[PDB]
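Predict the assembly for these three chains.
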Amino acid sequence: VPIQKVQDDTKTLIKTIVTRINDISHTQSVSAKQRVTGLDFIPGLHPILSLSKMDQTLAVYQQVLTSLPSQNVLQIANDLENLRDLLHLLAFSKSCSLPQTSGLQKPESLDGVLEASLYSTEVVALSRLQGSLQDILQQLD
Amino acid sequence: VNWDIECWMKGDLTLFICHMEPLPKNPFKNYDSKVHLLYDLPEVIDDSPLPPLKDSFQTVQCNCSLRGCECHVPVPRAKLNYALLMYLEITSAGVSFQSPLMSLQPMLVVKPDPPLGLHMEVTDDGNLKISWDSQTMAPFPLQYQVKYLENSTIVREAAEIVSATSLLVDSVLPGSSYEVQVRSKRLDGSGVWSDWSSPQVFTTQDVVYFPPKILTSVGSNASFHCIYKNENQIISSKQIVWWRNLAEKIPEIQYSIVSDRVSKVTFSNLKATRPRGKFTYDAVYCCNEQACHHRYAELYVIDVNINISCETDGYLTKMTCRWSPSTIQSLVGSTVQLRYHRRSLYCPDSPSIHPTSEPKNCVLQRDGFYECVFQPIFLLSGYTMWIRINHSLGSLDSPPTCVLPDSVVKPLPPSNVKAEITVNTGLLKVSWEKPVFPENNLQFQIRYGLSGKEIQWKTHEVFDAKSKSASLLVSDLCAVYVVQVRCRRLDGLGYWSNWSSPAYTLVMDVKVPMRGPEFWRKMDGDVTKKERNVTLLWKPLTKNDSLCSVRRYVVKHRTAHNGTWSEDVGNRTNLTFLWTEPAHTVTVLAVNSLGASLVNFNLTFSWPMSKVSAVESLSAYPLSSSCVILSWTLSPDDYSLLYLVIEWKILNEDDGMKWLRIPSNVKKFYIHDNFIPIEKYQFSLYPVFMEGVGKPKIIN
Amino acid sequence: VNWDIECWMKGDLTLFICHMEPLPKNPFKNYDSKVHLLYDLPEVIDDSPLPPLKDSFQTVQCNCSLRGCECHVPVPRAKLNYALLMYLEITSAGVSFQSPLMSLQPMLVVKPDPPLGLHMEVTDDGNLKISWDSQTMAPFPLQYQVKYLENSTIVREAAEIVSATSLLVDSVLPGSSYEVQVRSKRLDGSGVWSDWSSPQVFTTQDVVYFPPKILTSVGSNASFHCIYKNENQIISSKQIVWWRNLAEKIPEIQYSIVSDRVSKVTFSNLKATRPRGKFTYDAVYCCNEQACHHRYAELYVIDVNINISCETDGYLTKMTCRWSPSTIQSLVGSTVQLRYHRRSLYCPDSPSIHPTSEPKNCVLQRDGFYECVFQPIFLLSGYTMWIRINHSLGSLDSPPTCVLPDSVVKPLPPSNVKAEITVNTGLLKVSWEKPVFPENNLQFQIRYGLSGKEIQWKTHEVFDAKSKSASLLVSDLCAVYVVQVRCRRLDGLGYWSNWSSPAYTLVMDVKVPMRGPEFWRKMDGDVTKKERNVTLLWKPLTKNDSLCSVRRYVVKHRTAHNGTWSEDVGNRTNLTFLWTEPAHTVTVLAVNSLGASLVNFNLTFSWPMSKVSAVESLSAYPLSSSCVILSWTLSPDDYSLLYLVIEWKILNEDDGMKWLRIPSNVKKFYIHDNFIPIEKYQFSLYPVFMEGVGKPKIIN
């Protein structure tokens, strides 16, 4: 398959999910400056550069939101599984034969915070993934 | 043999327990030692030194085990204060040992049960309250010993003895655990200490809110509290910044310091809370300046309000109270109930949620309203009512409301509503039968309009509570009218009755047709014959002339010899009759149900003045295809002409004769008709007199 | 005492069974003979001649009956290959008999279970195929003996040994019965023959169709075979003529001779079977030429070409897939299931029926289709679709279809579309709000038209995905326009949005009137009177002069003394004013919301100039009742005539006034109006100048 359509597809689908999160989080306008304790297992205070690092961040994203019990979230999860597979494919299209290793996470502090603060957890989740994909779309160029 | 004996009264004050342990250990490993407790409970305190009879002691067989013997003495509660005389008989290896008689009061030696309901809560000053229940069944004071184990950054166990059922614990340490145990003992007498209760544990967070959750209403005032611990350091109240939903920082004007470790925030005049996507409240935050803890204080604010539409039936046997749950739908799990208290007097100016309130069943209709139907009813009793919504987080009430059954009455509709036309007056008379109602204090309303697809309803009110009928002016006396009568209480209280049956007016001739028709005559018969057919030619009466109707036409004739006679002509508008007399006049009457027409024209046929020509000249001037001028000159003779009649037709057309009576004073006339110029028109001007018709002037 | 002992390992390889029969018959009728089996299962094969210890043998109490003793020795499956040491202890009448030690291996002596699943079938060549199911648990090969007996006119019995699980019998005799029995035995070793299986009976018919049924699809090929037997003789395949539904002799070109007794017909490119009343199949008849036997072959051809349509919602929440079962109702009983596999990638160039498919639940509607909503949806995942028509004759799969949700997105109509006419440019500018969508790459289609019972819609497309408003050219600047917009994906994928709400512009005067009304005067007042009422008389502006509207008429007056002043006449078209000054200049202004008409008519009244005459002749020539020519001559004096104004009225009529301004250069004019020769007419010609209207010319 041609890679230009793949790139345009990535840009379009990511901005579609941007719209999804934006208008879902409408009753959830955020102040990005506040740090609440206990969601440290979400990085994102950093620029994302490499295919491996963005890939693993996204994998963790999926994993942490697996604890999140919703339905709009479930559709977003489908979206991200699609995006994860296509980023595998784009890394392949780079013609870099770097081995694609994955996994390597511990779901305990996540579940403690889950049983703690579902409200904060989901809202910071949406907001930080927003910022994450924002830096990503900055980085794709 | 030596024995150790412990006796205490059970907490239930029903059993006296004497626990026993042998001393020393195991010199008796294979013998069945039988221990008996012989007790007496004298009923009379008599000051006579008579020894008790040996047959008065009751014997209880003690239960002996490998660890000891326990003897249970049932003591009636009425004899707890009496002296319990008892002694022990122990039989072992064939040898009986009798203990000396002992006297005791079971009330003075009771072992209370351990207290229950152990709870730890934090005051708004940051101070822990260790709370437990007092034993109600105990008729004696209790002293409690409270052993707490502060498992804080500094582990602090202390056992404290209190008589109250709550303990003051100051300055709850954030991020710490606590183990507490409590036991009790009779305050007065040789109290036996109760066993230590189950340790209740209350563990703290580095940030503690109190009261953490708030359910409240719109416009109210409330306050949260915080104790912030930054790592191992408790953050000062001067340093705790409060936040709501972390999107709005609370002004420090609404902060307050109880103690330097304890921060408090204060709010006033709340409004209804909007769900945030799925999230449905306001999240308060305790933050060390910008250091916001992951924990929170949660605020619920709801708008308290609910109405209810109660209506008393016209038969005064029930109310139907109906209300909408549309405002309750926000909080899932909220259960609603209409609570009413009935009052023997009239409704107060301010309905109040009465403590003695009964629940009411209410049925949701397909409309989405809850229907509360009350039966039987008393019209003069004030029913104080409100809605109780039982959410999971407390019970809240709608504003109480009082309804009077007599004040919500809808009367029955007026009956026997009859629409008739008063004869010779033309007035719409509506008669009806009144609905059953107390005091007959009813105000009736009548609406009427033309019967048709669109009834232009006109309303008229009957304030007279004694009136059973009313008369209304109308303009058309020959049309059907739809009439309805509704009523309500004369004082205007309650509701209007629904409109009655549509009363339809019948159409009848209120009056005889106001005029007789204008007729002309057609001559069927040559001049030579003395007999000539007079084909009269008239037209039906219009609405005004017929008024309501012309049931028939009757042509009246007069002659010199035959006198006067009439011919019932009916609905046809012509009459051919033979002319045979020198003087012959014709009159047509328009007869309706009430009689013949009043005003009627006449036309005499006379042979001598059939020769008299009162018209000198006649001319026709066609203005257009739609107009022709007729002008004529009359003879200068003093002709007493009644009127002139213009007869015009297309020549060669014997069926195109058109006639019109015009006043005799007219000299030029304008005829409006579709005049075709190629057709030749015969214009004839007949002079008409009282005694006959004059000889006409004719032009072609 | 003598025993005939048989021992075998049970078919399940769990029990070793030793059956024992005493020899001879009945010398023992009243004694309890206890037979004890002692067996040993050594675990280690050690080459040491150490006798087995007497405490090692396990004793088995055998079940002895009047017919014999059965010994049940549990042999572990792991020890089936081990040496089973065996010896017997028989005690009877107080005497114990011990048999010599016996050694055997249970695996070598196994009696298998009988073969099961004895199916029977006819091959396409006309051969008689026996088949049965092998024992899946046997760890050793099984040899099968097959006994089949042919119940034809001659009874034939055959018993055959086979190593396979099927047997073939040649030359199926039509109208013959075959019963088969199969028994198994281990191929290697002294295996014990299994008991015969249940006999399976297969009776042939005079005509044998194989396959008698074919459930096939449209365009697919079906092959049917025959062995036709007439009476006692098998009809040769050369004589077999095939017929479909007995109404269509299948051509001999479609006849394939498998054998001298087997004729084969093969349908190719099969058409969907038309429902023949109660027949949903094509009946395939084997016939000896014309002698068609009453039995046939069933041919089922279904149309599996069902189109499935899928749509994605604008909120990007769900897929809506639909399809219609119209090709399925032909066969009653077919169960259809959509089987979906969601490929993680995009859809393949060739969608394929994926083995891992998932059952999908879909609803038949009132419209006859089946909807299939997919949730959650995956944007880049290939959703492979197909219906599985599970018919009783077999399951049929629709061609696999794969859908990517992006190309099936139907847009939301844009919100808040606004339509208005720009002022002073007349451009209908339309603004709309773009609904939420990915990439905003939206091609918008508008539709606009005049407001009325029938809107002649005009459309326009918006290719710029960034545009939010546009100005448009409309025909009527004062008529209401109705506008609707719909949007789609600019790439052409997805769908079009529903058309928006009708947008209505508001009618407003885009510009002032362009010309003032033509006004003449009605001259009221005696000539001897210096004061004379001047009744100005104009007419309302047209739609072109007013453009949209004129809100009021303003008459501006000018005098030498009072200067210039204007009088608003509003909506009125006449103005009577007194003439008092020698020169009074009057100008009527047509004013709308934006102001007065730019260019306006003027008319001056002057006593000195009202005496000046520029016309000497004027003649009325009646062309017809609809036209009259006025012919006149103008002065040789150099009168600067602005224009002439023709005045005509009916004499004796003060309300038959009509006027017309004509250019001053006119000498003859045609007045086209309804004209009555009877009445006398006043034709007046008005010379108009700078100084005022000169003295006019009037002809009767």
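DSSP finds one helix and 57 strands in chain B. The first strand of chain B starts at residue 2 and ends at 9.
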